[model samples]
Target chain A: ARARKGALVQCDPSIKALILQIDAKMSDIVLEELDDTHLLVNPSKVEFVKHELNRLLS
Target chain B: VVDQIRLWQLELDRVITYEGSLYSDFETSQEYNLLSKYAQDIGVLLWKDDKKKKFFISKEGNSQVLDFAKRKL
Candidate 1:
């Protein structure tokens, strides 16, 4: 099934550095629950997204 | 003011009745009835006493019940 999947990209220093470097217009943040573990988000909002997976896992 | 006075009278009555019923179980006498009546009467009597006290205390140094009793005529 084509389900909306939101992912917590591993927030390593490299990923954080790379995301910080990239500046783009971010909008349309629709929360789509793909499964119990995954959420699908708009790629545009990827920069706006913070790593919340750690908090949820904790 | 009248409503407040009525409310106070009602509360006094309730207290008098409760005390009479509760305390009379141990010491049965007309004393409780007198006490209840005194309680009711004193509500009004106290107001009069207070007015008398206020008026006479400054002039006479102290206002005794006997002094007021003479004025009751």
Candidate 2:
């Protein structure tokens, strides 16, 4: 297997849940979930995720 | 020229898992020719399938090639 160095996101479960939902829609943003509070996200999509989070907040 | 390389590498990175970064389905001879040429110029080895018009750039070469692509394209 190949290893990729990706951006990791650490957030509370609630926010993680929201991120998972967003990821499910796009299926490309989050590379993998590391349990409840940790996520391996695609580096390029980190800002995209943040933008989506902002949109969800509004 | 460089735009083509970026497009191929971008999609290749996205689609590739651990197996390989295999790029294929060239729309034209010019596209395929340019890619093979660029790979050679950059000292990156391209494993090509001339009949199918596809090539595989090694994992080691991806980073170097992508950096060059980003700069020019």
Candidate 3:
């Protein structure tokens, strides 16, 4: 699969906690913390993480 | 903006989800009684703990619960 570009996610504490939880639960999913406002991930084979964040889709 | 999540929680009071079976909103303990009746009709006795206010249901119930929880999100 072609690598998707990285993303910067601004998330609430609940979402952040989930990200951490899922990140550890699934290592292929990586989230790099940049600041109080950003989470970056190299992200490969990621529909599970994406699906979890589907609620955020507008 | 305030935590609208807090607003929703206050509005919803408490919603209980079975181990994954199903979910229902309750304003009082009486609702659990109603849920028990529904579960029995299906020939399944849901497992629930009053202390955690948690419940359990079948895998099918779990899918239903997950979908229901995501509805209109």
Candidate 4:
């Protein structure tokens, strides 16, 4: 049996800047609507985003 | 990793039940103890109700049974 894993990161005010920074570094970004304030991203992109966030935070 | 463990347990249960006898078959009064004892040997715990003529597998036992079912007979 195969199961897919997903992560949910809440988007605070700082997330927009992080997203833009990531977009600047990478191409082929895909965004899907998730209510008014949230966005759903593909699982593959999450690791990159998380790494960038960690870099920024550290 | 925790999720992977749970998934593997479920897979084992699926295989075991596919090959072994059905647990549902031992619903009869006389067979309940016999079947539950077998379950216990494989790390399952069982509780029987004389009034309702029913048997309940404890949470721990249920989990073990599920794993056993997946492993196949």
Candidate 5:
């Protein structure tokens, strides 16, 4: 067994959709779009995604 | 049978390459539901694609998941 580290982000489907959009517009930070409410994101870019999410939300 | 076992090993390797166990082609919704419920209750992060009927359980909980699935299935 191997271990790969990633950040898990759980959000509502709407926000998850927005995150996906942001991923498309910028550097890819999403490791996997998990279900409707979960995303495995790049740990390094997590802060940037958060910033963008706030921008989208506000 | 020997070739099949080798392919299964290879697939297992690929699944763990990203720190997740990919379980797919569930024979029934109950199988999927049972797995997901177990993972959720145990606080294991999961990624699932409903249409594809596949999911990845966090590596941290892979062992527990295997044990539960073994008994449940």
Candidate 6:
């Protein structure tokens, strides 16, 4: 997966891989959204998640 | 381009849902379309259950919202 013109650029097959990944990661985020039980002391973690997101989407 | 990369990731975090799927091909007027050029992007087009869900990425006339998406081109 990559980005051109800042648009999400992904090869055909990888899109499914991404959706499958979201299947798990999204669940993880949601579960954390509910059950994390604390305010984020680590905005840095979002940068990590965003980095991973950029790696996947970019 | 850097901005695009950032917003695309951020926007999608709000858009895609694990509870639903993106499907296509309906009567033209329903106007529900998602063309995933990259990714097999296979989705259901059932007569009933499938009709209920769609991801609103973009539309021809509505500029009110931005489409966070991937383009094959």
Candidate closer to the true structure by DockQ (higher is better), 2 or 4? 2
TM-score, chain A, candidate 4? 0.55
Please give the range of 10 consecutive residues that has the lowest summed lDDT in model 5 chain A: A1-10
Model 1 per-residue lDDT tens digits across residues A1-58: 0112232222334323333333223325433322232233445565454433212223
lDDT of 2 by residue, B1-73 (tens): 4666555434323321222244556677666666656776766543555665655555566676556545644
Query: Whose lDDT is higher: candidate 1's or candidate 6's?
Result: 6
Per-candidate TM-score, chain A: 0.36, 0.89, 0.59, 0.55, 0.87, 0.28
lDDT of each: 0.29, 0.60, 0.45, 0.44, 0.68, 0.30
Candidate chain B TM-scores, in order: 0.24, 0.53, 0.38, 0.33, 0.66, 0.22
DockQ value for model 5 = 0.02
Distance from true location, Cα of B20 in model 6, Å: 16
Q: Which candidate is the best by DockQ?
A: 6
- The most accurate candidate by TM-score is 5
- Tens digits of per-residue lDDT for model 3 on A1-58? 0112343344455565656677776666654554443355543434566565443332
Ranking by lDDT: 5, 2, 3, 4, 6, 1
Residue ranges of candidate 6 with Cα displaced over 4 Å: A1-11, A22-26, A29-50, A53-58, B1-50, B57-73
lDDT of 1 by residue, B1-73 (tens): 4666555434323321000001112132343333334434434211112211111111111223224334532
**Which prediction has more favorable TM-score, 1 or 2?**
2
Better lDDT candidate (2, 3):
2
**lDDT for residue A16 in candidate 3, whole number 0-100:** 58
- lDDT of each residue in B1-73, candidate 3, tens digit only: 6667555434322222222232334455555555544554564444544443334455444444434335522
Instruction: State how far residue B29 of model 4 sits from its true place (Å).
Output: 53
Candidate 2, residue A54: how far the Cα is off, in Å? 0.9
lDDT of 5 by residue, A1-58 (tens): 1235676676666567767888998957888776666777787877787667655432
Error (Å) of candidate 4 at residue B53 is: 50
